[PDB]
Design a protein around this ligand. Structure first.
Ligand SMILES: *[C@@H]1O[C@H](CO)[C@@H](O[C@@H]2O[C@H](CO)[C@@H](O)[C@H](O)[C@H]2NC(C)=O)[C@H](O)[C@H]1NC(C)=O
Ligand SMILES: *[C@@H]1O[C@H](CO)[C@@H](O[C@@H]2O[C@H](CO)[C@@H](O)[C@H](O)[C@H]2NC(C)=O)[C@H](O)[C@H]1NC(C)=O
Ligand SMILES: *[C@@H]1O[C@H](CO)[C@@H](O)[C@H](O)[C@H]1NC(C)=O
Ligand SMILES: *[C@@H]1O[C@H](CO)[C@@H](O)[C@H](O)[C@H]1NC(C)=O
Ligand SMILES: *[C@@H]1O[C@H](CO)[C@@H](O)[C@H](O)[C@H]1NC(C)=O
Ligand SMILES: *[C@@H]1O[C@H](CO)[C@@H](O)[C@H](O)[C@H]1NC(C)=O
Ligand SMILES: *[C@@H]1O[C@H](CO)[C@@H](O)[C@H](O)[C@H]1NC(C)=O
Ligand SMILES: *[C@@H]1O[C@H](CO)[C@@H](O)[C@H](O)[C@H]1NC(C)=O
Ligand SMILES: *[C@@H]1O[C@H](CO)[C@@H](O)[C@H](O)[C@H]1NC(C)=O
Ligand SMILES: *[C@@H]1O[C@H](CO)[C@@H](O)[C@H](O)[C@H]1NC(C)=O
Ligand SMILES: *[C@@H]1O[C@H](CO)[C@@H](O)[C@H](O)[C@H]1NC(C)=O
Ligand SMILES: *[C@@H]1O[C@H](CO)[C@@H](O)[C@H](O)[C@H]1NC(C)=O
Lengths: 49, 454, 420, 50, 50
């Protein structure tokens, strides 16, 4: 969805360097401050909040 | 084993250098019954071809055939395919129609050629188009075969492109031109280059029509493969100046080096198969009155003297030496570009246009544009190190980077550009409709009159 | 003072009626002031000497269209290749008569090799017309070979693109093996029974033995094959009730070649309507000057429209085949061929016979099951798909919620970790 | 020179699966090949930070 | 209003540039201003060009 859009190529190039397998990897990474942000569906992040 | 090498009249190749092509060669000869037969022949008709094939196969069981054609008939190699379906002998097509881009081989065939498929040559031409950023392109094809896979490979490349190519539907030529509806298709041209896929006489007819109609301007470039251009010893009439052709027939890496490499591959496969199986000479007895241990699945990864000459599954070379030539005003074909085993080298980095091609020419629509790197306006970064492609909301530029302080030489490094003024110039090119020529200033900052010197 | 017509031909009464057709072509167009002659070459098993006879009898003949007329060859190679390979040296079209292979239907290898018969892939269109008879969508494709199989699969994809639908499963394999029975059981596991087969004789006998071994000839199964599958032991090993095709005037050799010679003669007289008539050059002695009216002859032949014919309205399509041929639809009723339908240019007409199926009644078997067993897959989503290993062996810890409701679980199958 | 699919779509289109019950991210690319259903859940996109 | 630019025809058709000018038309309402026989010719060419 971000690869389709015409001006979102910079965030595509940023996110393609650190692609993670599962979402819980990103959860533990932002828990241990390995990341700083994560694009994800809303209600699932509300549930994990 | 016994290898007979017959030729015609291509590259003015005589016979005595073929007699001298065996003496110092094969010093570590583990096959003992190796003999060479150097022959020449004027007649390139299939009757004499079948006659000499039967004479050499009946001539003490020759297991190697090396032939280079000088004519413009690729079906001779298909004739060799009919020879490969009957003799079942490893045969190599070397020059001309014996090694043109043929359609499809057979699993029952043991024939091979020098060169590659049309898909790797299309990949080289699309790499040229990627390096030169000509995203506005055409595709003009006749009904000459080998076109379905070629156009299909182009469509699967554009449909799976990270570049954003601008493509029109395929211009098709059905029959000999009426100059009523095919003229409309040539007036349905897509700009900035012309890509052509046809035969030799069809190329003569299409270039004659484009010369009579004036489709050879400075914007409409001409990029063709070897199948459109033809053989190198003869150059036909009515050719536009600036005809970029992609072939593999080198004059420096001439025909003698190619047949020496072919003899090296054949002797290498024979010496590698003789140590595995004993009774290597097993051919057909005679043509009158009609094998398992063959080299069909054994000599694929062959390499003699470090030459990248491995075999494909379709019967070609995996990474052959591709030669990209142009045409000047002096009717000469000069080498410009070469192809590495992974990349594509470009000698003439500053791309020439060959301005002496037609009568009238303005220097319109291209405006020399210079700028300086400012962070909210002019963001200049490197190109992608993996794909070599600026993303299509960025524009290319060149910079005259001097190498070191002692030398005065500088290169033209191409870099991607995003920012505010980039979008300003792109919207001006949308509205005012002018093509940009963006580069950077290398003298320094914006500008100052240093004692009546700016 | 003659124009030769080349044929690779065996029977001598057929030579007599061939010369009679040449005479009937010479009777019309009385203003044409040059004569014809015939040339025919017979059976020789050695193909090198076949090509030798071709290049000795056709280069020095200045022929316009060549007719290869040997279907019942004892060699299993079935190669009319050297005639087209010799005539393609000056781009001269040979009009074939015998085979229907995709390798001879190809515009890539064969430059301008036309014929008077369509390939087998159009039979799939007839099978698509069968899809218009019984109104069936989910199909199963099994092809032994790979040369004609790619063309048949491409034609079937074109047919399904015309409906804007897709097939269920296609299969290709190595012709000669016997352990494709697992793929036939996978086809049994599919939700349809439409069995479409493209195979040779031995491959058809192999899959008939595999179908009898797996009892694939019961109720609901839709058996539908082509022309090679009703010959030899494939005719013997076929189940009673299989539906096959038949080419009208396909094995009728004489009338088909007579209509072909009529088409060739009218195409030659149509080619002589205009100017720039170049003969094929005598290439036997040092001549490679190409016959440059090749595309001119192709423009005449590919646009040649006809209305006369014993076989029917014969006309060349975009590939140079038979347009809109009437076909026959046969049934194997107790090892006996029973005609159960005819086929127009685009329509099927069943006769008054009974379409007997290998299952139960003569009515059509609706072989689309209601899919009682389904397959569910999902990704491990944290709030959605909780995956937990069992306690001891295959059991689930039935726990409650905060309101006493037990969490309804399910027994799934999942891998441990990723591939590294 | 052809792109393919993997994952749940790669196991569905290969015939190994029949129906996918999952958080299906509805887009335009998948609808060109397969059919969708009417969504049970309505949900967008956001950013999780610390 | 959405006005396409003025298509100009000199005389009876060459069938080399007039067809190109008629292919420039992409709108819905064609405002034709010519004679009666020229209107017959232009409607015949538009029927031929679809
Ligand atoms: C042609 O292919 C050859 C063989 O793959 C390449 O040669 C290799 O180059 C790398 C360094 O780039 C070395 O590590 C290898 O040892 C080389 N192999 C040998 C034995 O040659 C070569 O780079 C390719 N490029 C050219 C020159 O076309
Ligand atoms: C050909 O191979 C298939 C697949 O392996 C065989 O089918 C299975 O054979 C095993 C024994 O090797 C049996 O245990 C299975 O029950 C068979 N499958 C089913 C579901 O019937 C098949 O038997 C082989 N046929 C030949 C020629 O031996
Ligand atoms: C035969 O030799 C002649 C010498 O002029 C040459 O031009 C020609 O290409 C050769 N091929 C033929 C036509 O046999
Ligand atoms: C030849 O090279 C190919 C590609 O690396 C490989 O698949 C094949 O196994 C090799 N064959 C030999 C001689 O081992
Ligand atoms: C020239 O510059 C390059 C880097 O741009 C450097 O690698 C090279 O050593 C320099 N050569 C000399 C001799 O100054
Ligand atoms: C390069 O050479 C010039 C010569 O005057 C010198 O002034 C300068 O300091 C040198 N350094 C740079 C900028 O490379
Ligand atoms: C026709 O040609 C054959 C040889 O192919 C010859 O025997 C016969 O006499 C010829 N007939 C006439 C009268 O042209
Ligand atoms: C037919 O074959 C299958 C193979 O599993 C077998 O189970 C069945 O009993 C056989 N008999 C019938 C009912 O046709
Ligand atoms: C049918 O084929 C036979 C040869 O089996 C042939 O004699 C006859 O002319 C053909 N025509 C008819 C009557 O269908
Ligand atoms: C025949 O050839 C001549 C010379 O090329 C040409 O002028 C003429 O138009 C051709 N005839 C036809 C009907 O194409
Ligand atoms: C084939 O069917 C057509 C109607 O489509 C019919 O006119 C014709 O007679 C049939 N062919 C023959 C030779 O009977
Ligand atoms: C022939 O084909 C036509 C196509 O419209 C079809 O309507 C008709 O049912 C077919 N049968 C005959 C012989 O009329």
């Amino acid at each position: 969805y971000f690869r389709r859009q015409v001006e979102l190529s910079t965030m595509y190039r940023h996110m393609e360097k650190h692609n993670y397998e599962s979402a819980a990897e990103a959860i533990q990474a932002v828990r241990d401050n390995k990341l700083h942000a994560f694009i994800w569906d809303s209600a699932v992040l509300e549930f994990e909040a | 084993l016994n290898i007979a090498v017959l030729l015609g009249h291509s590259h003015d190749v005589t016979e005595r250098e073929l007699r001298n092509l065996w003496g110092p060669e094969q010093a570590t000869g583990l096959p003992l019954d190796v003999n060479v037969v150097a022959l020449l022949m004027n007649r390139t008709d299939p009757k004499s071809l079948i006659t000499h094939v039967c004479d050499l196969m009946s001539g003490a069981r020759i297991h190697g055939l090396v032939f280079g054609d000088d004519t413009d008939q690729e079906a001779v190699a298909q004739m060799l395919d009919f020879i490969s379906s009957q003799t079942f002998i490893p045969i190599l097509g070397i020059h001309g129609g014996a090694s043109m881009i043929m359609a499809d081989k057979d699993p029952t065939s043991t024939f091979f050629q020098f060169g590659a498929s049309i898909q790797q040559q299309a990949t080289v031409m699309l790499k040229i188009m990627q390096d030169y950023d000509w995203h506005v392109f055409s595709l003009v094809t006749t009904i000459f075969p080998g076109y379905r896979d070629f156009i299909s490979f182009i469509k699967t490349t554009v449909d799976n492109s990270f570049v954003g190519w601008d493509m029109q539907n395929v211009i098709t030529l059905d029959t000999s031109f009426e100059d009523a509806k095919t003229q409309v298709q040539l007036k349905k041209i897509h700009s900035s280059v012309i890509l052509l896929y046809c035969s030799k006489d069809e190329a003569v007819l299409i270039l004659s029509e484009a010369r009579s109609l004036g489709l050879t301007g400075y914007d409409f470039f001409w990029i063709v493969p070897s199948l459109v251009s033809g053989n190198t010893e003869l150059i036909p009439k009515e050719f536009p100046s600036g005809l970029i052709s992609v072939s593999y027939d080198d004059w420096d890496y001439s025909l003698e080096a190619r047949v020496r490499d072919g003899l090296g591959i054949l002797t290498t496969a024979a010496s590698s198969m003789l140590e595995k199986f004993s009774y290597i000479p097993e051919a057909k007895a005679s043509c009158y009155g009609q094998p398992l241990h063959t080299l069909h699945q054994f000599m694929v990864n062959v390499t003699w003297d470090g030459k990248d000459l491995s075999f494909t599954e379709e019967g070609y070379q995996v990474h052959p030496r591709l030669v990209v030539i142009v045409l000047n005003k002096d009717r000469e074909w000069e080498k410009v570009g070469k192809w590495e085993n992974q990349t594509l080298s470009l000698r003439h980095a500053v791309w020439p246009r060959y301005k002496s091609f037609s009568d009238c020419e303005p220097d319109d629509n291209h405006l020399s544009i210079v700028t300086l790197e400012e962070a909210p306006f002019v963001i200049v970064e490197d190109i992608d190190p993996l794909t070599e492609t600026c993303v299509r909301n960025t524009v290319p530029c060149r910079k005259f980077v001097k190498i070191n302080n002692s030398t005065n030489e500088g290169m033209n490094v191409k870099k991607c550009c995003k920012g505010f003024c980039i979008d300003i110039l792109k919207k001006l090119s949308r509205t005012v409709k002018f093509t940009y020529d963006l580069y950077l200033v290398t003298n320094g900052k914006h500008g100052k009159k240093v004692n009546n010197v700016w | 003072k003659i124009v030769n017509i080349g044929a690779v031909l065996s029977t001598r009464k057929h030579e007599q009626m061939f010369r009679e057709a040449v005479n009937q072509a010479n009777k019309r167009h009385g203003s044409w002031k040059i004569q014809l002659n015939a040339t025919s070459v017979t059976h020789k098993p050695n193909a090198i000497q076949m090509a030798l006879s071709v290049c000795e009898d056709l280069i020095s003949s200045q022929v316009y269209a060549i007719l290869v007329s040997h279907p019942p060859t004892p060699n299993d190679h079935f190669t009319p290749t050297p005639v087209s390979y010799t005539a393609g040296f000056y781009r001269i079209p040979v009009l074939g008569l015998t085979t229907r292979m995709s390798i001879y239907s190809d515009k890539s290898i064969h430059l301008s090799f036309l014929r008077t018969v369509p390939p087998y892939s159009h039979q799939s269109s007839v099978w698509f017309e069968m899809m218009r008879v019984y109104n069936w969508n989910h199909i199963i494709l099994l092809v032994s070979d790979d040369h004609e199989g790619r063309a048949a699969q491409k034609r079937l994809e074109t047919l399904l693109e015309e409906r804007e639908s897709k097939a269920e499963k296609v299969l290709q394999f190595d012709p000669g093996t016997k352990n494709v029975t697992a793929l036939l059981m996978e086809a049994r596991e599919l939700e349809a029974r439409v069995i479409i087969l493209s195979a040779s004789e031995d491959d058809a006998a192999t899959v008939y033995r595999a179908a009898a071994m797996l009892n694939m000839t019961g109720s609901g199964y839709v058996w539908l094959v082509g022309e090679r599958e009703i010959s030899g032991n494939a005719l013997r090993y076929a189940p009673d009730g299989i539906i096959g095709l038949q080419l009208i005037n396909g094995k009728n050799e004489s009338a088909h070649i007579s209509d072909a010679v009529g088409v060739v003669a009218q195409a030659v007289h149509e080619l002589l309507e205009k100017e720039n008539i170049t003969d094929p050059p005598r290439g036997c002695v040092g001549n490679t000057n190409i016959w440059k009216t090749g595309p001119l002859f192709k423009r005449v032949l590919m646009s040649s429209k006809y209305a006369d014919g014993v076989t029917g309205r014969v006309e060349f399509n975009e590939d140079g085949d038979r347009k809109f041929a009437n076909y026959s639809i046969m049934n194997l009723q107790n090892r006996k061929l029973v005609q159960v339908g005819i086929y127009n240019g685009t329509h099927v007409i069943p006769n008054d016979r009974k379409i007997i199926w290998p299952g139960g009644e003569t009515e059509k078997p609706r072989g689309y099951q209601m899919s009682t067993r389904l397959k569910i897959v999902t990704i491990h989503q944290e709030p959605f798909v909780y995956v937990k290993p069992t306690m001891s062996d295959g059991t689930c810890k039935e726990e409650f919620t905060v309101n006493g409701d037990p969490v309804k679980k399910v027994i799934c199958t999942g891998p441990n970790d990723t591939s590294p | 020179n052809k792109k393919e699919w993997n994952g749940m779509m790669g196991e569905l289109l290969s015939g190994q699966a029949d129906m996918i019950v999952a958080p299906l991210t509805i887009n335009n690319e998948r609808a060109q090949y397969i059919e969708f259903s009417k969504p049970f859940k309505y949900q967008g996109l956001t950013i999780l930070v610390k």
